[PDB]
Structures are given as structure tokens and as C-alpha cells.
């Protein structure tokens, strides 16, 4: 009776997948047993972290379904995610409302 290694480390992400992609993707000669685990986690975490802010953004816009816009707003307001994804662009994302100060009426 077998159990996914994902649960062994109790992760929601496919720990087996990660290990495979680490090999099918040739990054190194060999690959430790925890490498797929650790990474799998870091991935699950990051995905979990931006889904949290997206859903919030989705809750503010008053709807129950995350869409690209929400992921933009999420990623664009959190300093740290914005830097991780600085040279990235979210299709259908848009920009953060922002009129330069000096343009407004006086």
C-alpha cells in the first residue's frame, strides 16, 4: 500500500512531478531525495501566497472568481511579489490605477 511522497512531506503539490522535471529537464547529473520536496514546497507556498492576495482583490472588486486583473493588482501592490515578477507581464492584467500627481487639476 503506497502513498504519494507529497503527503509524506504533506504538500498539496506533486512532489513526484517536480523530481521528474528536475531530471527530464537536465539541470544536474543527479538529484537528491529532498530537492523535489523542498522546491515543491517553495512552489506551493508562492502559489498559495499570491492566491491569497488575488482572492482578496477578487473579494474587493465584489466577485467570487479570481481573474487575471485580480492577479495583477495582487502582484502589483505587494512590494515583494512585484519585484519577483518585475520583468513579467500578465496577459489581460492591466495596470494599477495611478494618475501622476502633477497632472491633476489645481
Amino acid at each position: 500500500k503506497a502513498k504519494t511522497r507529497s503527503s509524506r512531506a504533506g504538500l498539496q503539490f506533486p512532489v513526484g512531478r517536480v523530481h521528474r522535471l528536475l531530471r527530464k529537464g537536465n539541470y544536474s547529473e543527479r538529484v537528491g531525495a529532498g530537492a523535489p520536496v523542498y522546491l515543491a514546497a517553495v512552489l506551493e507556498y508562492l502559489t498559495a501566497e499570491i492566491l491569497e492576495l488575488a482572492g482578496n482583490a477578487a473579494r474587493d472588486n465584489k466577485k467570487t472568481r479570481i481573474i487575471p486583473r485580480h492577479l495583477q493588482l495582487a502582484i502589483r501592490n505587494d512590494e515583494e511579489l512585484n519585484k519577483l515578477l518585475g520583468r513579467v507581464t500578465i496577459a489581460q492584467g492591466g495596470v494599477l490605477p495611478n494618475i501622476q500627481a502633477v497632472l491633476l487639476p489645481k
Binding site: 513579467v88 500578465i90 496577459a91 495596470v95 494618475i99 497632472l103
Partner: protein
């Protein structure tokens, strides 16, 4: 069918104007419209070149989403949304 000729003029003014509002610009110098096409054309080329190159190296007669993406990636202009 018909021959594709000078279609950059398609990227009208109302549009370039728009792309510029979402950009935050309130007042647009009239010479801007021709400059934008100037750059849009260069950008579009560079991305598309790399794309097709990818298309060719894969001995294909079709440009695919991934091509355009491995392209943007290469160009350091990483896109998400078709990425797979």
C-alpha cells in the same frame, strides 16, 4: 490573398492615444503618433523574428504561442497567459 502592405498605419491614432492614457499620459504631442509606430514596429519585429526563428528550427510552417513566448522570454519581456 491581397498583398500585405504598410499596415502599421493600422495602429491608428485613437489607439496610440489610448495605450497612452492607460499609461497615464494626459497631453500628447502630435509628433508622438508617428514615433510610437516607429517603436511598435521595431519591437514587433524583434519579437517576431526570434519567434519565427524558433518556428524554423522546429521545421514547422506555423508560428505557435510557445514560439511567441520563448521569444518574449528571450527578449527579457516574459509573458504569462499562453505560457502553456
Amino acid at each position: 490573398r491581397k498583398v500585405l502592405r504598410d499596415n502599421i498605419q493600422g495602429i491608428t491614432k485613437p489607439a496610440i492615444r489610448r495605450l497612452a492614457r492607460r499609461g497615464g499620459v494626459k497631453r500628447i504631442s502630435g509628433l508622438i503618433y508617428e514615433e510610437t509606430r516607429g517603436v511598435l514596429k521595431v519591437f514587433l519585429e524583434n519579437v517576431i523574428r526570434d519567434a519565427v526563428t524558433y518556428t524554423e528550427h522546429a521545421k514547422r510552417q506555423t508560428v505557435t504561442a510557445m514560439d511567441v513566448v520563448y521569444a518574449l522570454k528571450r527578449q527579457g519581456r516574459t509573458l504569462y497567459g499562453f505560457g502553456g
